[PDB]
Design a protein around this ligand. Structure first.
Ligand code: 3NK
Ligand code: 3NK
Length: 247
């Protein structure tokens, strides 16, 4: 990984030590990016619902993961499952149980810094993985992209700024998650998020992290080329809100 400071350094060190799983996959790879394109063609708003027991954002919600997943199966384009343990209270067992319970695409959201974590995602039933430009050297990012692609996954590449985008495009990203998160305030910079979206080629599938969980924001972004939306706290708090977001 890159050399880091603070809690990202900590979580990367934890991740490097994470024991791998041994399990045979007995679930198809259900492509998230393709399902998003399908929703776009059908004019159905495509929302990727997070399951996250905790978040550094103040998030502290206990709710049954299977009940949540089965509810979202009806509405969401896919699920994003936090599997990082220390800051998000995630677990591989929770991912496995969720994957064994629904047949919509599942993104394993963690801090992937070694190949065996991609093996873990595959073996546990996830359909793809998050890769984070800001924690990986360029060579690592390219290699891990290729390694995920070796399983038939297309990873979601997380960018937070223009430097991350330059790297992501150079290494061949085709599925990009645009955050533009400030870690002091914990707020999405909407202006910058929009600038980044405008800089992405038309042949990249684009997912925006939503801070403001409202229909009008979705409509503006969709107009600007965004294909799908990641939404976390508001859906963990009130799952049924997704219905009003998709109309
Ligand atoms: C989960 C709700 C968000 C998450 O897992 C995550 C990971 C890494 C990351 C890096 C950023 O900048 C480099 C911004 C946001 C973010 C969110
Ligand atoms: C999504 C609207 C917020 C999100 O993904 C996120 C991820 C990680 C993170 C870390 C923080 O501490 C450094 C603060 C906020 C925050 C928000």
């Amino acid at each position: 990984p890159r050399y880091l400071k603070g809690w990202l350094e900590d979580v990367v060190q934890l991740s490097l030590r994470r024991p791998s799983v041994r399990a045979s996959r007995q679930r198809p790879i259900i492509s998230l990016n393709e399902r998003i394109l399908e929703f776009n063609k059908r004019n159905i708003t495509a929302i990727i619902a997070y399951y996250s027991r905790k978040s550094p954002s103040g998030l502290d919600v206990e709710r049954d993961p299977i009940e949540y997943a089965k509810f979202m199966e009806r509405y969401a384009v896919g699920l994003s499952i936090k599997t990082e343990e220390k800051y998000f209270n995630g677990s591989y067992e929770t991912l496995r149980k969720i994957a064994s319970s629904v047949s919509i695409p599942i993104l394993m959201s963690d801090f992937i810094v070694k190949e065996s974590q991609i093996d873990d995602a595959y073996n546990l039933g996830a359909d793809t993985v998050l890769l984070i430009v800001k924690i990986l050297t360029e060579r690592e990012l390219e290699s891990l992209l290729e390694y995920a692609r070796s399983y038939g996954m297309e990873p979601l590449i997380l960018i937070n700024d223009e430097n991350d985008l330059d790297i992501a495009l150079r290494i061949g990203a085709r599925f990009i998650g645009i955050f533009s998160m400030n870690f002091e305030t914990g707020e999405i910079n909407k202006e910058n998020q929009r600038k980044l979206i405008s800089m992405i080629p038309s042949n990249v599938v684009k997912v925006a992290k939503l801070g403001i969980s409202e229909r009008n924001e979705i409509e503006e972004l969709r107009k600007l080329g965004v294909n799908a939306f990641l939404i976390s706290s508001s859906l963990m708090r009130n799952p049924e809100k997704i219905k009003e977001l998709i109309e």
